[PDB]
Amino acid sequence: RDTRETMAFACRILAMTEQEAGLAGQISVRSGAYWTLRFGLGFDEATPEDFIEVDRDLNTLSGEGMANPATRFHLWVYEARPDVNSIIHTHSPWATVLATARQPLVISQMDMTPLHNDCAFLGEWPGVPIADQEGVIISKALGDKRAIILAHHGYLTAGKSCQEATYLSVYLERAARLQVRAQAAFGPLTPVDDTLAAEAHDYLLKPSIVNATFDYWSRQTQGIAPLTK
Template sequence: MNTQLREKAYFDQRATQDMAKHLRTQNRSLQETMSYACRILAMTEQEAGLAGQISVRSERPGAYWTLRFGLGFDEATPGDFIEVDRDLNTLSGEGMANPATRFHLWVYDARPDVNSIIHTHSPWASALAAARQPLVVAQMDMTPLHDDCAFLGEWPGVPIADQEGVIISEALGNKRAIILAHHGYLTAGASCEEATYLSVYLERAARLQIRAQAFGPLTAVDDTLAREAHDYLLKPSIVNATFSYWTRQTHGVPPLAIK
């Protein structure tokens, strides 16, 4: 038997083609997707009272969709999302936005590539934030965050005004995630699915980092290999298939808006 040794690029291309064929995108409304995202965040223990936020850029310029204030991630239904303008006036749906989502506007203005933002005070990422530690990508499952997780070393206060949005958006720069010292984290995705995917893996990465530090200083993954893994694991087909798997873990159907 003569096994041919092929370049890794061959297998990457082959896998990409196969995933495009076999990993089909699920058809959901925006509100269903956001509802699932909230349930996934709750399932991964990322709720912190009403401190968590989710938003998706609206087709209407200067507006975004968000969970109406007063609800936790675990209770979100497709009917609980509202569209708000730059002054947080409600344009569609009923209720008010979390006033702390104002800083999302600054991220959307600075980053045309970002269509969804998630911010939580999850336990493990918040532990890194409390210790004022940036993320160290030291294991394969952390590589979606390789060179893609910024760090803000000073807390600007509760982000209900414009200045906090300026500080956070500038610190985020061109990255998809950021650890906010004394605060929590933020992920910024090209889609709601990507922002959720990054959120789950950032929380896992923070947990892994804190646990691994018990054995001594961490060694970061080789930069070239980490960059390769980053790009592979952020392929939209992988992101969307993973999100769909997580939706099935939340029982596979969007919760009905029964009041």
């Protein structure tokens, strides 16, 4: 119940922080099974009852609905990364600009540091590959990283929890927006010092900050009343 509620909030947060590209969004949580948003729904309409548990053959083991067959590749990532418990893939507007231009992230600001030495870049675009080819390609290119920019496609985040995968997704999208806006006006950016970036990376990825931020974004999706007159 807690997992489905967390996944529903993660979906609403991703929709609120403007990540939508038709029905291209995917989310999963490790259960050889995984929890995922049922087929045909967007992140903005997800409720706890829309998350189903499914095996390697995409058979539903718990809940009502069918899995989005495009999430089958997530099993290869979970198999390669025992530390990963949640995966998010979207074609969000600004991260997809970096993907389309074949441009890796350049760590030049405090909030970009959760991706410092933690964002892989897959240069090859295999088109619409089958689940197995995509899983092997993405697991290999991801390596031990928390995120990957997929050239000509979008991005994927891989977190130890659904809260961490969501936090990485939002921070990667905002980091991409900052980099694209800054390079359009001023050209290539000078990165910050690697040692200080690694310290800021560890600071921003502490569970207390990740969970408090996820809970804040969750409250924002529910609506906040203006101050009374």
